[PDB]
Design a protein that fits this description.
monomer; about 120 residues; mainly alpha; Histone Acetyltransferase, Chain A; about 70% helix; binds N-methylquinoline-3-carboxamide; binds sodium ion; gene regulation; PanDDA; SGC - Diamond I04-1 fragment screening; bromodomain; epigenetics
Length: about 120
């Protein structure tokens, strides 16, 4: 149907927007602390602590499969990256402090993204 194609065009352009947001958020992680899943070889007990791991690479995989239906789903995954880190790592660590900075600096990007999604009506 024509309607289904229209919907797919919308999802595709949401995906385009979210890819830009993702790239912008990842730029705020030059240390690349959040680039890849926390290694169970480097951190054997991680999954005992964190029930839903997340990282930028995993987000990108879902993104490219057009697995984010709206900005809220994307934001949920971004929040997981931050929140997991602030629980697994203590306040005084380079890890925790990196999450705080990512959350603060990411907020600006997500604030405008929300306005753009609403504006262009991508969901
Ligand atoms: C977001 N990353 C982490 O939370 C983290 C924590 N500890 C680690 C220890 C050794 C190697 C990697 C680690 C990663
Ligand atoms: Na903690």
């Amino acid at each position: 149907s024509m309607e289904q194609v229209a919907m797919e065009l919308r999802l595709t352009e949401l995906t385009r927007l979210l890819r830009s947001v993702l790239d912008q958020l990842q730029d705020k992680d030059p240390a690349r602390i959040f680039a890849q899943p926390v290694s169970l070889k480097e951190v054997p007990d991680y999954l005992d602590h964190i029930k839903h791991p997340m990282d930028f690479a995993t987000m990108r995989k879902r993104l490219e499969a057009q697995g984010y239906k709206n900005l809220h789903e994307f934001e949920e995954d971004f929040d997981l990256i931050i929140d997991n880190c602030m629980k697994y790592n203590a306040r005084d660590t380079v890890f925790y402090r990196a999450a705080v900075r990512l959350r603060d600096q990411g907020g600006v990007v997500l604030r405008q993204a929300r306005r753009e999604v609403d504006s262009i009506g991508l969901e």
